Design a protein around this ligand. Structure first.
Ligand SMILES: CC(CCC(=O)O)[C@H]1CC[C@H]2[C@@H]3[C@H](O)C[C@@H]4C[C@H](O)CC[C@]4(C)[C@H]3C[C@H](O)[C@]12C
Ligand SMILES: CC(CCC(=O)O)[C@H]1CC[C@H]2[C@@H]3[C@H](O)C[C@@H]4C[C@H](O)CC[C@]4(C)[C@H]3C[C@H](O)[C@]12C
Ligand SMILES: C[C@@H](CCC(=O)O)[C@H]1CC[C@H]2[C@@H]3[C@H](O)C[C@@H]4C[C@H](O)CC[C@]4(C)[C@H]3C[C@H](O)[C@]12C
Ligand SMILES: C[C@@H](CCC(=O)O)[C@H]1CC[C@H]2[C@@H]3[C@H](O)C[C@@H]4C[C@H](O)CC[C@]4(C)[C@H]3C[C@H](O)[C@]12C
Ligand SMILES: C[C@H](CCC(=O)O)[C@H]1CC[C@H]2[C@@H]3[C@H](O)C[C@@H]4C[C@H](O)CC[C@]4(C)[C@H]3C[C@H](O)[C@]12C
Ligand SMILES: C[C@H](CCC(=O)O)[C@H]1CC[C@H]2[C@@H]3[C@H](O)C[C@@H]4C[C@H](O)CC[C@]4(C)[C@H]3C[C@H](O)[C@]12C
Ligand code: FES
Ligand code: FES
Lengths: 359, 359
């Protein structure tokens, strides 16, 4: 009856309503794992307020907020039901959501897991491919929480810190692509070009050693292997802001370029995230597939469905947690190597926090 | 007895002696697929002349020239012996070397293939991961040869234009890594960090859509899977020159960064080429492993042996060719998609050259 094993699902989060946008931005801009600003305690609230209207308008364009919490909860519930049956010795299992910049915040979830008196806590990132700016930032929040509160954990921690080639995740993407290919006019299907798209990183981050581009490229290859190379593809990158150099090719410039070169039948595949959110519902579906694509003369542009409530995806999550438990690993071998040019002192503390855990 | 199937092994090549350096550079700078320069017919000989002394000195430091022709010949000979047994319907097989910028030049090889009266010719790039700047440039040379001689081919052409995850290539890399791990002191072996290293590309090339970074990342993941994630790794990129932005992290900076961060036992793995050449014998072995690494206080830095004369690598080559023949394929599905921002008119012509071939 009392939960024994807590699976803490980590993600950045998104504002559920338009009223949550300002505080989302403020927590983001206060976070030094992402950015160091001059006079940051002053500029953070200011830039949050400055950007609120633009960002609320994007969310209003997709129906008034992000659905991430809904999807995460449905996935969490399907995962736990499977885990109680796969793993009766670590049952009952209970999921907790720990979002970095909206409620329930990472720190609020840890407080609850400790209150619930769990024996074991698993920090399970919902980003299959690791970036120090996504999963690294969620794992640092766990280390900082105990550091700030000045007490040690009362539960045994470990982390599933990446899973870019999990076989059932791969199957979920391949399945979604095959379904969407069937939605193109039959006479176009062979002609379709696949653009896998993932959020970009600034080159300053790529060049310091961030593991993300190599892992996202691995996911793309395993998906194309599963599909037997039925269509040609490129991996391209979305969401660049600001005037600094980021990893390209850009998704928008790639859609326009393909159109200008006669490839007017394009299937977009979000490959680095597992539910709908602003990047899919606003950036890909509206900004590129409605506005940009209409202006460049595209014939058909479609997007693979996000994994969202697919029961095969819940089965992937539970398979990941079960295999983790059975292996007794505390973290990947990759978490034990920080970036070769890391300049953030917290990363090594975070690494040690996980590699040193009792058990 | 008359040869029936020719396998054209494509590679950029390297100067075999110090005297060949100038004409190597001059052919390279006269190649539009690789670069456009102002007043290129004047500037190419001038830049070749300017760089000759520094490049001759690099080759002198490694014994007086590139061994690429030796290794390519040994691999070609072993591949042909296997193919005559594996594929008697297409035997006898004959290999031909087509180097882009040294003799025997691509154009000289095609001449000899035509004279030999082969039934078919296979353009087999020796770069497992495709870049428009490597394999694309060599395939463009085949299209341009016929275009410039004003005659259609007299043999059926097809291409093996990439093979970044062929299982025996992956085995050869994993085998070389395990052998080199065995040469560290035993007490350091689990502490070893692996840096997979590949020639970089400028960001202008990456951002136009070059398929290379994603393919090299795929090779890395399949090698680490075969090794069961026994050590941690990063993929990083060598050989940047000039002042423009290129894809990082840089290999040199990453070795020094790792050293400064207490990771002093490092295994370098050249992952994008299959024999020794100036990148391994000069840049990694001298510039980085002798000079840089001594300066930064490294404890052990070693390099996986290049594939070179490994018989399992001849077996991979022959298996590639054999599968290619049995499949009847003219080229990969990926060759049918040019880069989304390609601005070189020859790419489409080369693509069509192969996709339109009779059979
Ligand atoms: C200096 C800097 C970032 C630091 C860095 O990259 O190391 C940038 C990032 C966000 C910038 C701020 C935001 O763009 C919002 C403001 C925009 C105005 O055009 C200038 C002031 C303004 C307040 C900016 C000052 C400065 O250029 C900031 C603070
Ligand atoms: C303008 C240009 C490239 C153009 C382009 O990329 O569009 C660059 C590439 C290589 C350059 C040249 C090479 O670096 C060699 C020469 C170097 C000297 O320091 C300047 C003149 C010199 C002759 C350069 C002139 C000019 O800056 C060139 C020609
Ligand atoms: C590039 C990067 C983080 C920093 C980093 O990787 O250095 C990512 C992580 C969270 C991202 C931010 C969050 O998604 C929230 C904002 C979303 C807007 O659509 C752009 C600005 C916005 C503020 C983002 C800018 C940038 O893409 C961030 C800061
Ligand atoms: C960057 C690039 C090719 C062009 C491209 O990618 O746009 C690669 C392909 C062949 C490379 C060149 C060849 O390896 C020959 C030269 C080798 C020297 O060590 C550097 C300059 C040198 C001239 C190289 C510069 C650059 O790295 C080239 C030109
Ligand atoms: C879009 C925006 C500012 C808003 C504004 O002028 O209104 C700014 C605020 C802080 C910026 C970020 C911070 O400067 C930290 C990162 C710095 C990197 O050099 C580029 C991305 C990077 C993640 C920046 C991207 C972007 O230019 C941000 C998110
Ligand atoms: C190293 C060198 C010139 C030598 C010199 O001035 O001494 C120049 C000559 C032509 C240059 C190349 C050509 O300009 C074409 C490419 C231009 C890209 O913007 C960067 C790499 C790129 C491949 C260049 C790298 C490098 O700066 C090269 C190879
Ligand atoms: S920035 Fe990657 S480990 Fe610190
Ligand atoms: S530059 Fe890549 S296809 Fe032309």
């Amino acid at each position: 009856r009392k939960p024994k094993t807590g699976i803490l699902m980590l993600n950045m989060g998104g504002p559920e309503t338009l009223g949550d946008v300002h505080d989302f931005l403020l927590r983001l801009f206060l976070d030094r794992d992402l950015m160091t600003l001059p006079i940051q305690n002053k500029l953070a609230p200011f830039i949050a307020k400055r950007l609120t209207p633009k960002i609320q308008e994007q969310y209003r364009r997709i129906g008034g907020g992000s659905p991430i919490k809904i999807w995460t909860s449905k996935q969490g519930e399907g995962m736990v039901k499977l885990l109680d049956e796969l793993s009766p010795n670590t049952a009952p299992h209970k999921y907790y959501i720990g979002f970095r910049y909206v409620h329930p915040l990472t720190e609020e979830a840890i407080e609850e897991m400790e209150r619930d008196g769990l024996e074991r806590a698993i920090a399970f990132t919902q980003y299959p491919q690791y970036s120090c700016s996504t999963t690294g930032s969620s794992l640092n929040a766990i280390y900082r929480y105990y550091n700030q509160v000045g007490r040690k954990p009362t539960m045994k921690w470990s982390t599933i810190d990446r899973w870019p080639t999990h076989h059932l995740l791969i199957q979920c993407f391949a399945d979604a692509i095959l379904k969407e290919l069937d939605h193109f006019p039959l006479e176009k299907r062979s002609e379709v070009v696949i653009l896998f798209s993932a959020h970009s990183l600034p080159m300053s981050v790529v060049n310091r050693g961030d593991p993300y581009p190599q892992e996202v490229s691995a996911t793309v290859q395993k998906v194309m292997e599963r599909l037997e190379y039925c269509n040609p593809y490129r991996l391209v990158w979305q969401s660049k802001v600001g005037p600094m150099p980021w990893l390209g090719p850009q998704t928008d410039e790639s859609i326009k370029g393909l159109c200008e070169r006669g490839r007017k039948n394009i299937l977009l595949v979000p490959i680095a995230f597992t539910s709908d959110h602003i990047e899919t519902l606003y950036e890909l579906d509206i900004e590129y597939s409605q506005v940009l694509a209409k202006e460049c003369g595209v014939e058909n542009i479609r997007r693979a469905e996000s994994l969202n409530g697919n029961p095969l995806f819940s089965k992937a999550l539970a398979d990941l947690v079960h295999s983790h438990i059975q292996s007794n690993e505390l973290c990947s071998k990759q978490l034990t190597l920080s970036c070769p040019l890391c300049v953030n002192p917290v990363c090594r503390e975070t690494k040690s926090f996980f590699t040193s855990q009792q058990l």
